[PDB]
Amino acid sequence: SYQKLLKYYVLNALKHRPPKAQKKRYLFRSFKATKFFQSTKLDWVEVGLQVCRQGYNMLNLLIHRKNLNYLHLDYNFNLKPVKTLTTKERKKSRFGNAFHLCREVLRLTKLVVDSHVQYRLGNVDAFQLADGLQYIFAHVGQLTGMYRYKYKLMRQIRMCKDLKHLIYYRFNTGPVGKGPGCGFWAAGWRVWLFFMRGITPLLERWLGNLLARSHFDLELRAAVMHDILDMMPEGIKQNKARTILQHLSEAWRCWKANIPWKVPGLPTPIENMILRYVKAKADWWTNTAHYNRERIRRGATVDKTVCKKNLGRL
Amino acid sequence: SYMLPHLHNGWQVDQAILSEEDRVVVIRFGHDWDPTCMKMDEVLYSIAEKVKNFAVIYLVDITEVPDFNKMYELYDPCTVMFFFRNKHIMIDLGTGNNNKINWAMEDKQEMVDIIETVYRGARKGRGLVVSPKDYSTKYRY
């Protein structure tokens, strides 16, 4: 744990770049300048409860807007189905990693605020409150299913556990032994706030979007066909498109065979376009043949068609 | 390009399936821009005239014709659908679902064999036919 904490400290100190010049725009000052926001003074527990309620309501609105009445979200932000999902319903229920990540963030906030309201009610002692906060910030992965939706988050989790190994084995010296009584939650709270800093813009962008209002030859052939058929008389293009496509195929075959290709009745602008197309496709063909041969000779996994084609090209 | 005929509404599709009596109707549900659909349509054009005697190919855009999305579970970026005398033919490719190809094979001979087997099983009377190959493994080594 010490070694990995040092590793992450060194990584932070080495990947560090000096901050870039800004214009100093403050979000909350802008919010206060509008009519939709108003200021007051409130207890932290009250705003914690209010934020939990607002998060639950907003998640309910997002769920109900998709008409996914078969999924129920409890007050602990644990989303569960109520019936066997149809394939159409199962596809409709694919909310993505962003929604689940936001839901688990709101669940962690619910956990912290619920511990604080539990202390405020008087059921548990302040020492119990601090120890519970330490446990919450050291066991986010166990208490909350965060790692699946965002894999990088797992790293943060290990940090917290490492920090526990840093604190406990210093806290539990002398008369104090192993026990559930150690409350020191600065490190994990710091780590999860720093994770929240990084993931805030992602969830904001997702919510804004949700609440708004290889094959070079084929593409080359399609693009040259579109360009030619745009510069084409409307009344004549019924079969001339097929004729010029046959001409393109014949030109490609003729280049592949080292045989002269000179259509006498073909006008010179169309002929020059076909020559350019054949040149581009031949360059791509040669390059991809060489690349595939290098891949096969190196030992990459390939199927029969690729090898057969490569052999032909080569 | 896409010289294969396209169907622009559900009406075109549902009389195209009933238009052919001695030929297998092939419908590609997807989008031209979709690369996978591009590979399959190139393969189909490579064999469009080879199977003219006993098969026909039509291209249907999902955005243009979205009525078959729910009934045919058209949730993949691309599907290939086989009909004969108004009856769908399921093909046992070994991929788990027998209703649609759902993938783009580069070899045109594989598609030729698949459509030939579908025709043989449809004319004989079996609604479900077995692919003469296993596509569970990509056979890459």
Binding site: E219, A222, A223, M225, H226, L229, D230, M232, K237, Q238, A241, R242 | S1, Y2, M3, P5, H6, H31, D32, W33, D61
Partner: peptide
Amino acid sequence: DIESSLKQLAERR
């Protein structure tokens, strides 16, 4: 016919 699909492809790509 072919041009109708070419315009759709170009617009979508």
